Amino acid sequence: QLFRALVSAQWVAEALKAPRSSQPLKLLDASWYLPKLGRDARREFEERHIPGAAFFDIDRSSDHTSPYDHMLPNATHFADYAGSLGVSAATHVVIYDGSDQGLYSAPRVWWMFRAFGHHSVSLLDGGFRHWLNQNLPISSGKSHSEPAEFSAQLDPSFIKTHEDILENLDARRFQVVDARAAGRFQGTQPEPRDGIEPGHIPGSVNIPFTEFLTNEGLEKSPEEIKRLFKEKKVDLSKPLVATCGSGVTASHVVLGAFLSGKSDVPVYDGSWVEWYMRAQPEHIISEGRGKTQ
Ligand SMILES: Cc1cc(=O)[nH]c(SCC(=O)c2cccc3ccccc23)n1
Ligand code: NA
Ligand code: NA
């Protein structure tokens, strides 16, 4: 009783050859990379992308009035932007990116469409990496589309707030799962944002987003995902909230839970950037020694 979250490269290639008029397919490249990788997602799209794809820029689908990173825009802003990419309520949106990991930032966009009330959305398992590995056809050129009518409404159950995370330190009403790399979580490797130092939220559990994916960047099976959660002491029959640096890679936790039957995993959108900025010293658990310490 959920719309499929994953489609395969083979499924996509077939759809490109057999298009479905009543349910049009819109392919979106949502690649986004941290600056230190020295990659230009938009330019890469211009060079190669899945045929007929548009480029979904997650910096044009964020609230720039926030001091935090990658915050959900309001619904009017999202709808304007999704309609400008040619997405209507009839559309089966399929999102990918070109990350080394397979999928990286695309899960965030799958989550956002759902959050804003568009449930016919999936992700291309293995992303562009796998598409290229299969020697499937590619196109070049800047992104474009005719505009379409799109409406959005945010369901707030998709989000948790700082206030919620804070209340939960004592209340322990939900399990917080943090998708950052282990060393950022532990406090021994740097955070990408200048002025943010690493560490973790007290009581949270680290499941780096890479552990949801196979060695070659395909999704693990639901059998293996359930095993992962359980080995990390996360109980899927209890509430679960996903978090990371800025709320982007958190969406792999959300996806993994969705594929294992649990559809209601909210994202703490403010994530570690917000948490660190709004913290008292008791709120920052780290093996690293602060400037103050
Ligand atoms: C997506 C992501 C993944 C991740 O592992 N961590 C973060 S923290 C936000 C951030 O570094 C950041 C976000 C936006 C722009 C920036 C510009 C400079 C440096 C850091 C960031 N974000
Ligand atoms: Na965010
Ligand atoms: Na930093």
Numbering used by the authors: 5 to 297
Quote the study that presented this structure, word for word.
Hydrogen sulfide (H2S) plays roles in many physiological processes in mammals, including relaxation of vascular smooth muscles, regulation of inflammation, and inhibition of insulin signaling. More recently, it has been proposed that sulfane sulfurs, i.e., sulfur atoms with oxidation state 0 or −1, existing in the form of polysulfides (H2Sn), glutathione persulfide (GSSH), glutathione trisulfide (GSSSG), cysteine persulfide (CysSSH) and so on, actually mediate some of the reported biological activities previously thought to be regulated by H2S67891011. We determined the crystal structures of the m3MST complexes with 1 and 3 at high resolution. The most remarkable feature is that C248 is persulfurated in both crystal structures.
